[PDB]
Amino acid sequence: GKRSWDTESVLPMWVLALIVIFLTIAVLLALRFCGIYGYRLRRK
């Protein structure tokens, strides 16, 4: 692809991909920091 895609795609994949990792890390971190807390157990 030589044409200045600029718009890597009207839906830039890297932007889409970055979003997933941000959330990926967020959920993993969420679980651990909450891990020590034992998070919850709402049911209780």
From Swiss-Prot:
Subcellular location: Membrane
Transmembrane annotation, as ranges: 15-31
Modification comment: May be phosphorylated by LYN.
Subunit relationships: Heterodimer of an alpha and a beta subunit. The beta subunit is common to the IL3, IL5 and GM-CSF receptors. The signaling GM-CSF receptor complex is a dodecamer of two head-to-head hexamers of two alpha, two beta, and two ligand subunits. Interacts with TMEM102; this interaction occurs preferentially in the absence of CSF2. Interacts with FCER1G; this interaction is direct. Interacts with LYN. Interacts with JAK1.
UniProt family annotation: Belongs to the type I cytokine receptor family. Type 4 subfamily.
Free-text comment on this protein's domains from its UniProt entry: The WSXWS motif appears to be necessary for proper protein folding and thereby efficient intracellular transport and cell-surface receptor binding.
Clinical disorder: Pulmonary surfactant metabolism dysfunction 5: A rare lung disorder due to impaired surfactant homeostasis. It is characterized by alveolar filling with floccular material that stains positive using the periodic acid-Schiff method and is derived from surfactant phospholipids and protein components. Excessive lipoproteins accumulation in the alveoli results in severe respiratory distress.
Biological role: Cell surface receptor that plays a role in immune response and controls the production and differentiation of hematopoietic progenitor cells into lineage-restricted cells. Acts by forming an heterodimeric receptor through interaction with different partners such as IL3RA, IL5RA or CSF2RA. In turn, participates in various signaling pathways including interleukin-3, interleukin-5 and granulocyte-macrophage colony-stimulating factor/CSF2 pathways.
Name of this chain's protein: Cytokine receptor common subunit beta
Organism of this sequence: Homo sapiens
Gene symbol of the encoding locus: CSF2RB
Full-protein interval shown: 432 to 473 of 897
